Design a protein around this ligand. Sequence first.
Ligand SMILES: *[C@@H]1O[C@H](CO)[C@@H](O[C@@H]2O[C@H](CO)[C@@H](O)[C@H](O)[C@H]2NC(C)=O)[C@H](O)[C@H]1NC(C)=O
Ligand SMILES: *[C@@H]1O[C@H](CO)[C@@H](O[C@@H]2O[C@H](CO)[C@@H](O)[C@H](O)[C@H]2NC(C)=O)[C@H](O)[C@H]1NC(C)=O
Ligand SMILES: NC(=O)OC[C@@H]1N=C(N)N2CCC(O)(O)[C@@]23N=C(N)N[C@@H]13
Ligand SMILES: *[C@@H]1O[C@H](CO)[C@@H](O)[C@H](O)[C@H]1NC(C)=O
Ligand SMILES: *[C@@H]1O[C@H](CO)[C@@H](O)[C@H](O)[C@H]1NC(C)=O
Ligand SMILES: *[C@@H]1O[C@H](CO)[C@@H](O)[C@H](O)[C@H]1NC(C)=O
Ligand SMILES: *[C@@H]1O[C@H](CO)[C@@H](O)[C@H](O)[C@H]1NC(C)=O
Ligand SMILES: *[C@@H]1O[C@H](CO)[C@@H](O)[C@H](O)[C@H]1NC(C)=O
Ligand SMILES: *[C@@H]1O[C@H](CO)[C@@H](O)[C@H](O)[C@H]1NC(C)=O
Ligand SMILES: *[C@@H]1O[C@H](CO)[C@@H](O)[C@H](O)[C@H]1NC(C)=O
Lengths: 120, 173, 1140
Amino acid sequence: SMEVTVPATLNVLNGSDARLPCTFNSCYTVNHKQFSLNWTYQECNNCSEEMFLQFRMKIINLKLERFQDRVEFSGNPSKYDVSVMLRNVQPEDEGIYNCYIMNPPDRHRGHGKIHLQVLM
Amino acid sequence: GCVEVDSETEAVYGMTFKILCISCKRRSETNAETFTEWTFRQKGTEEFVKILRYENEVLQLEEDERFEGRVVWNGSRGTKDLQDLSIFITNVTYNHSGDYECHVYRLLFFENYEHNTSVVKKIHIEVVDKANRDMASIVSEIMMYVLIVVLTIWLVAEMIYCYKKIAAATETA
Amino acid sequence: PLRRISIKILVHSLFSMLIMCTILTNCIFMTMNNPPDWTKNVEYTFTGIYTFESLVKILARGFCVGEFTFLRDPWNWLDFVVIVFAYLTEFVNLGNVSALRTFRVLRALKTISVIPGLKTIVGALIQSVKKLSDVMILTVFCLSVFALIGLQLFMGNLKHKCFRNSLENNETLESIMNTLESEEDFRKYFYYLEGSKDALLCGFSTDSGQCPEGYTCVKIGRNPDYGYTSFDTFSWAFLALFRLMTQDYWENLYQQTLRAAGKTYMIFFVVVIFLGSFYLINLILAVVAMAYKEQNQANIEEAKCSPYWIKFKKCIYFIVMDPFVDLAITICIVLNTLFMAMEHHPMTEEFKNVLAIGNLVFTGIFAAEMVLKLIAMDPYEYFQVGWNIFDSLIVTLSLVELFLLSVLRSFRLLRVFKLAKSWPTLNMLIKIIGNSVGALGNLTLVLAIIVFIFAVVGMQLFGKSYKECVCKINDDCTLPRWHMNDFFHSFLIVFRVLCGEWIETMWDCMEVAGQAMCLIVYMMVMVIGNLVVLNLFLALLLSSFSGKIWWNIRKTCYKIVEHSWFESFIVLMILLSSGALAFEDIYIERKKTIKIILEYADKIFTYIFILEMLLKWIAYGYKTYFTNAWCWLDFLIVDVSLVTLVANTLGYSDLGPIKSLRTLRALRPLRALSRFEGMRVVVNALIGAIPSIMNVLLVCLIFWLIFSIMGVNLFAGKFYECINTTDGSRFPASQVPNRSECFALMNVSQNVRWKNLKVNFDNVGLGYLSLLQVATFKGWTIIMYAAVDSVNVDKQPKYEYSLYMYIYFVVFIIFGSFFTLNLFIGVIIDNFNQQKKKLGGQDIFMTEEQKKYYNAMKKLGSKKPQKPIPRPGNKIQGCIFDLVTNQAFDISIMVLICLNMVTMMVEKEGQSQHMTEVLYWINVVFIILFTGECVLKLISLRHYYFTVGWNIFDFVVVIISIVGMFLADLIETYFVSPTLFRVIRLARIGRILRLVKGAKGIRTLLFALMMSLPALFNIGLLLFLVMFIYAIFGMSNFAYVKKEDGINDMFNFETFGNSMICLFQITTSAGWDGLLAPILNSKPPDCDPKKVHPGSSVEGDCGNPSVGIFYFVSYIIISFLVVVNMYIAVILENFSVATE
Ligand SMILES: *[C@@H]1O[C@H](CO)[C@@H](O[C@@H]2O[C@H](CO)[C@@H](O)[C@H](O)[C@H]2NC(C)=O)[C@H](O)[C@H]1NC(C)=O
Ligand SMILES: *[C@@H]1O[C@H](CO)[C@@H](O[C@@H]2O[C@H](CO)[C@@H](O)[C@H](O)[C@H]2NC(C)=O)[C@H](O)[C@H]1NC(C)=O
Ligand SMILES: NC(=O)OC[C@@H]1N=C(N)N2CCC(O)(O)[C@@]23N=C(N)N[C@@H]13
Ligand SMILES: *[C@@H]1O[C@H](CO)[C@@H](O)[C@H](O)[C@H]1NC(C)=O
Ligand SMILES: *[C@@H]1O[C@H](CO)[C@@H](O)[C@H](O)[C@H]1NC(C)=O
Ligand SMILES: *[C@@H]1O[C@H](CO)[C@@H](O)[C@H](O)[C@H]1NC(C)=O
Ligand SMILES: *[C@@H]1O[C@H](CO)[C@@H](O)[C@H](O)[C@H]1NC(C)=O
Ligand SMILES: *[C@@H]1O[C@H](CO)[C@@H](O)[C@H](O)[C@H]1NC(C)=O
Ligand SMILES: *[C@@H]1O[C@H](CO)[C@@H](O)[C@H](O)[C@H]1NC(C)=O
Ligand SMILES: *[C@@H]1O[C@H](CO)[C@@H](O)[C@H](O)[C@H]1NC(C)=O
């Protein structure tokens, strides 16, 4: 079982930068072809998931319209780090952010879930 | 397992002779495919005319009269990875005399490596009318007898000297 | 008032019992490994009982006086730690729960305090450890010196791999290495021997080698075994050597270095194993045993209708018939066991039923006697005797079998012991088992407690890691056979370590759990666990233990035989005759000339021996000649040689015997035994003990038979499996569940085979072989995997179906190996003791001349003071003398040498030039200072300096050291040959040896080793001759066997040099199982009976199963007997030196 560390709730002021910090821990050494990381967003608990960033050989930023160009990768995965950064957070960014990590040879897939709340 | 032994250099006339060419792989476990060529140049003449080629299982023999007929494969059989290549001649003749060069071609299959190698074994034989006993055999037999005779002479020699002394002791007392 | 109540509560019969009962229950809980959530409440209660038990003691003892009474005792400190820890955890706690939780295991330690008398045993154990202080220092020093020698000689050697010659796209060895990291990727590039974990080790020299053509040898990459097995660093070298000392899988290190290094280095291993392992381990036993005797003995010394029943009942008692009826039954019991011995995997239907009919009769007879037995003496009278109750339980079990776990049924065989009362030795074995749970029950209990704590501790610490990591350790992604995930499994690993099997498992733990943690836990189990085992063994063993011209001619020949030249001449012939034997082998075809002389040479030898024998007859006469044991041996040997010679000249040769007879030649070295005085003395001792050994063997055989019979019922015919021939992997069982199913696959598939183990429990005879491997721990694991895996007779084995069958092996090892070995060792050493007593209390391992020399060495022990020396008159000369004489100055030199030693340790593989240069320079200063000290002692001391033995050693070391540095330098300028250079540097290790002078404790032990060299030499000579005879038998018999496991190029019987290497390896019985296996297979498809073998006449590569088994088994037993002899010599000398 992959070890995942994230804040269950993350409260950020509107207009500030929000680092979404998650810790993934598993035995072995990470492999570039082998290591894959996926990040998805939901407007609400039951809402459809929208993938917005992936690691497949390298970082792929999907540039979803809902985020403009405010998403950045913010983590060194070799360190078990897969954090992301949401610059200049807006009220519509409130919702659920999911990190999924599948790491060969580890069969298990890690999952971190952050509830991002935007202050006023 | 396989051992490399050099072939005999003297063939009696009018009798069958076997020529030995043995090549051993460095590692027994590895598996490779082999084929051989034997070329012979008669004494008093330069160069070599290939006489036979053995690939697959069938043996191919050149049409030259000197070796036409008279040759049979004595090599490893059915292996397809010969290791030992030897040629046996029936009805040895003077014409079969000179230098023999045998080259081996081996395809070694490795995990992702295919290796082609060549090793050359040359056999030189001279035909003689009567088999000649090896010098080592003769020297040893003559040498062995001398030891048998010398030791006995030494043993008998002591007794004549020792025994006389023993006989002398009884008389004194 | 309250204090009285608490105090009243504190000392009570029930309270000690109550505290203890909860603790045992607590232990069951630790074993959970993922306890349910509900169990948490139970956890709280245990915490509650301890505080309450803990609180009262503190309340009553302290009197609110600082708990003076409470904390004064050392054990109570432990209780306080446990209470705070349980409490501390609820309170803010440290991050690692598993690391922190492990402490809870401490509660188990509490049990030690509660049980009565346990405290005494633990204290007794600690006292023994104190005696071991000197041995520990020597062991570290000894391991350290070898580590330094090993590191210099073999550093970077394990690195060699065969790198392929041709690389596409302009790739380079350097370029290739950084880019790729995968076993699949690696395999394409380096050789890899068909499924081995790591790349084949190659060698530069002609002796080692070799890489297949098209592959070249270069050194790069990690060492084999995950990088764990390497000689690169001092720490790594130390681990490698420690493994050699305890002999754990030592054979592989030996095989691996020789291959990379080359066979010439086999010498390093012989010296290390012979001195470092056999000797060091023996020293530990002597000290532990010696220490135990003082304490055991010191403590011991201080102490000192109704009427009809009576008529019928009286008759039954007459029926006891001890002279015949009681005796008659035992014959019946022996017969019954013999009946049970007949079983096999394949049994005809009629035969199977007969066994069933036969068993019922025996079951009935035993019960009838019991029912009949009851009537004669009455029930109360009947159950009074213990054997009767013992007999009763067995009979009852049989009755229940008919109507109401069929294995228990197999259990009636124990009945066989009944014979123990009659037999003197069997009675002894019965006594030994009793002592462990009897008087020594407390000590044995401690072993059980310690094994339990470790199993649980290992489980807590590494249990999680094995599951998550799995892959680092296993290719498959599933748990390996030996792992620490569960308590039973964690327990199995701990038990394995008690036998010296620690290294194989440790590599696995290290991959998953990291080096620091795994190393600390394993090292502790091995040291602490073994000490307890050693104590139990030794404690158990010691406690349990206590004209007529014809006459002139006849006189003259007698003169010739007696004469020294003749005796001397004959000995030369024997050595020469024996030597000719070595030349024959697979390579004899080449070098045809040597073959011819050797053949002729033998004839001269045959004539000389026959001639010598005739002189013997005339000189001694027939009566004197045949009443001698040696002559018969001598007479017999000439005859075999004589028959072959007459048969050979005649022709009519090669028709089996006489041809089998030729192989009998190997016996020629045997005549050498009579000639050497040293060899003969050792042989006399063994003959003295064969009768005694025979008695123990009978008990072992009878005892092992029950285990073998039991084993046959459980696993007979169940070891078969369907395997993929290409990689030898068992099929899943999802498909091909039974043998019938397996055959269908073969009909539609080319390489699937249904095959048996080769060493198994199919019949009683085979079971004995299977048991032998388990007893020696060699080849034992393959069998155990088979046993647990097994399901049914014609069914494919499921993975770990039985799982609890492991218990059978554990029980056999404790009883079969631990107890019998205890018995075997006890009788042999004691018999040796009686022999010593008979021959006027004189050592029985030395020739008369050796005895005179031994006495001289004894003289060195004396400390009478040598002359002080006079300071020369000159003050300049005197002050230096004054300075040199001072003890403080000498201590400084001792410190300097230690500083020098640390410098050697820093050296490591691939260090770099700046690093290399500094070490070279520091070394020079050391040589100058040491040379400087020598000159100073000389200026003041003068002739007096040469008087001391130590000074001479010190002086010699300096000469060697300067020369070693210069020669290496000259060698560098001259160049050509790195190898001569490494050996040359070995000279520096000489200075480190001077440390011995400083330590008084280590020197006494060293002196003891020196004293026993004469005795050890004789045994060594005898051992060498036996090894030699075996090598010859092996060369003829086993060359040409197919190469499978333990037999490959090198370490094979093809030539004499090779045979010797193997025999040395098996002397310690390591890998004996591997060599034997190729010999066992016979007939297709295991092997091809007729194989070409180019360059040779012989056909086929089939081992003789019967001949092979006798050969390996006989050797294992013989070597073991001599080794038992080695221990006896070491112990005797050790007691004497320590005693002085
Ligand atoms: C026995 O094991 C062999 C060795 O892996 C299996 O052979 C492989 O089979 C697959 C498909 O048939 C091939 O793609 C592989 O190349 C084979 N390996 C090699 C190197 O030959 C074989 O399938 C197994 N036998 C059966 C009947 O399943
Ligand atoms: C041995 O195993 C075979 C394989 O299952 C058993 O025979 C049958 O297997 C077939 C598949 O080809 C199934 O359709 C049948 O149901 C199986 N037998 C029955 C009666 O169901 C066989 O029974 C097993 N035992 C033996 C043959 O001793
Ligand atoms: N498999 C087995 O018997 O386990 C025991 C241990 N493990 C090995 N892998 N070995 C290699 C060969 C061997 O003899 O079996 C052995 N070598 C030693 N010293 N003990 C054995
Ligand atoms: C990509 O993200 C999706 C979430 O919709 C997840 O299901 C999938 O496993 C991810 N891809 C990989 C390769 O992990
Ligand atoms: C032998 O050699 C001669 C000349 O070299 C040739 O004419 C003759 O045909 C040879 N013998 C045979 C049988 O071919
Ligand atoms: C060599 O050839 C001869 C020709 O008859 C044959 O009889 C012999 O058996 C062969 N050598 C071998 C393999 O014995
Ligand atoms: C050898 O050759 C002659 C012909 O010159 C032939 O007659 C003879 O049969 C041959 N030898 C044998 C053994 O066949
Ligand atoms: C190597 O194999 C090739 C096949 O492509 C063959 O033509 C060539 O002769 C072989 N090399 C040698 C030296 O025989
Ligand atoms: C060496 O590598 C270079 C790449 O820079 C390549 O162009 C060249 O052909 C290679 N050399 C050979 C002999 O193939
Ligand atoms: C292979 O099974 C076929 C069925 O098609 C059968 O005819 C054949 O005899 C089987 N092979 C053997 C060796 O029995």
